[PDB]
Amino acid sequence: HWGYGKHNGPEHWHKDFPIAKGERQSPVDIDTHTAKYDPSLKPLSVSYDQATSLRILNNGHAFNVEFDDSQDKAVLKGGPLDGTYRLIQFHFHWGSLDGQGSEHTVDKKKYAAELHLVHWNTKYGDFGKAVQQPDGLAVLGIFLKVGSAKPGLQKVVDVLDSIKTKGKSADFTNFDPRGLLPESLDYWTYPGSLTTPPLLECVTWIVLKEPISVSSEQVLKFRKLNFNGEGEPEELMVDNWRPAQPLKNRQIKASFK
Numbered sequence: 001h002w003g004y005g006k007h008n009g010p011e012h013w014h015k016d017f018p019i020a021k022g023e024r025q026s027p028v029d030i031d032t033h034t035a036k037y038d039p040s041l042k043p044l045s046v047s048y049d050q051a052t053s054l055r056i057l058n059n060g061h062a063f064n065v066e067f068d069d070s071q072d073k074a075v076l077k078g079g080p081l082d083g084t085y086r087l088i089q090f091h092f093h094w095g096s097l098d099g100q101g102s103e104h105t106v107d108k109k110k111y112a113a114e115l116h117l118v119h120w121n122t123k124y125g126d127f128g129k130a131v132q133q134p135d136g137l138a139v140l141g142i143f144l145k146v147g148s149a150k151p152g153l154q155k156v157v158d159v160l161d162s163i164k165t166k167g168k169s170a171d172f173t174n175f176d177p178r179g180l181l182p183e184s185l186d187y188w189t190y191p192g193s194l195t196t197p198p199l200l201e202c203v204t205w206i207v208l209k210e211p212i213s214v215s216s217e218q219v220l221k222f223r224k225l226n227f228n229g230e231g232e233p234e235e236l237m238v239d240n241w242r243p244a245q246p247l248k249n250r251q252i253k254a255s256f257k
């Protein structure tokens with residue numbers, strides 16, 4: 001199956017997922033000089049006060065923090081979005097060293113990691129139906145740089161020892177994702193895809209301009225996770241990022257002047 005290594009990584013995915021060479025693939029490089037302010041963007045609304053986290057899972061690619069998405073609780077609205085998008089899960093992409101790990105890049109600069117908060121459009125009823133639609137998903141992307149610790153990340157870091165290997169999960173109730181955001185909601189937006197197989201072209205990307213700072217110790221604990229299952233030879237879970245893909249017939253819009 002697909003992964004990130006030399007023999008099953010991003011350069012191989014097109015053989016089983018031909019959309020990998022499609023017209024609106026993600027991630028992309030964000031050229032900040034070419035991105036244009038868009039006055040038709042409405043105010044962005046991140047409404048996470050009633051979020052209900054449930055569980056954290058090592059899926060063999062990354063770890064997902066899962067939310068109760070049976071009701072609107074935690075929703076993203078506004079900005080480029082028509083309608084209401086409900087939070088289903090968040091996860092990260094990160095590197096083997098601080099100089100790489102992000103999927104999006106900013107004027108070709110790679111960050112140490114990138115957080116993705118995944119939401120689905122409630123007009124389609126369920127995530128599975130949403131991923132059959134051009135406007136089914138909205139992903140809020142946040143860059144991580146290494147500096148001061150992020151206090152709102154520490155609960156995540158401290159549970160990772162209990163989900164070291166593929167297929168392990170743990171209770172993860174009462175986690176507040178608001179503690180993962182930066183101060184500013186300035187953003188760039190463009191139409192794209194899932195960055196993992198099946199690479200479906202369903203996503204409105206909203207990438208925040210301001211990175212969050214995390215400590216070296218925090219990201220080092222991400223790098224102690226394993227891609228492999230229990231009892232199998234250790235393969236550290238690092239470099240679980242797809243590189244930038246061709247922009248093709250797209251424009252990146254900015255929320256700020």
Ligand SMILES: NS(=O)(=O)c1cccc(F)c1F
Pocket residue numbers: 001002003007008009012013014015016017
């Ligand atoms: N196209 S894929 O990355 O999902 C893949 C899956 C299994 C074996 C492979 F060699 C391979 F490339």
Ligand SMILES: NS(=O)(=O)c1cccc(F)c1F
Pocket residue numbers: 116118137139193194195196
């Ligand atoms: N990396 S990603 O945010 O594009 C992503 C990954 C897995 C499932 C998703 F729905 C998704 F959006």
Ligand SMILES: OC[C@H]1O[C@@H](O)[C@H](O)[C@@H](O)[C@@H]1O
Pocket residue numbers: 036251
């Ligand atoms: O035709 C002019 C239009 O070109 C488009 O490519 C841009 O997105 C618009 O901002 C601009 O007004």
Ligand SMILES: OC[C@H]1O[C@H](O)[C@H](O)[C@@H](O)[C@@H]1O
Pocket residue numbers: 155159171172173174175176
């Ligand atoms: O909020 C997420 C988790 O944080 C800490 O691990 C708490 O000990 C646990 O009870 C909670 O589920």
Ligand SMILES: [Zn+2]
Pocket residue numbers: 091092093116195
């Ligand atoms: Zn992702």
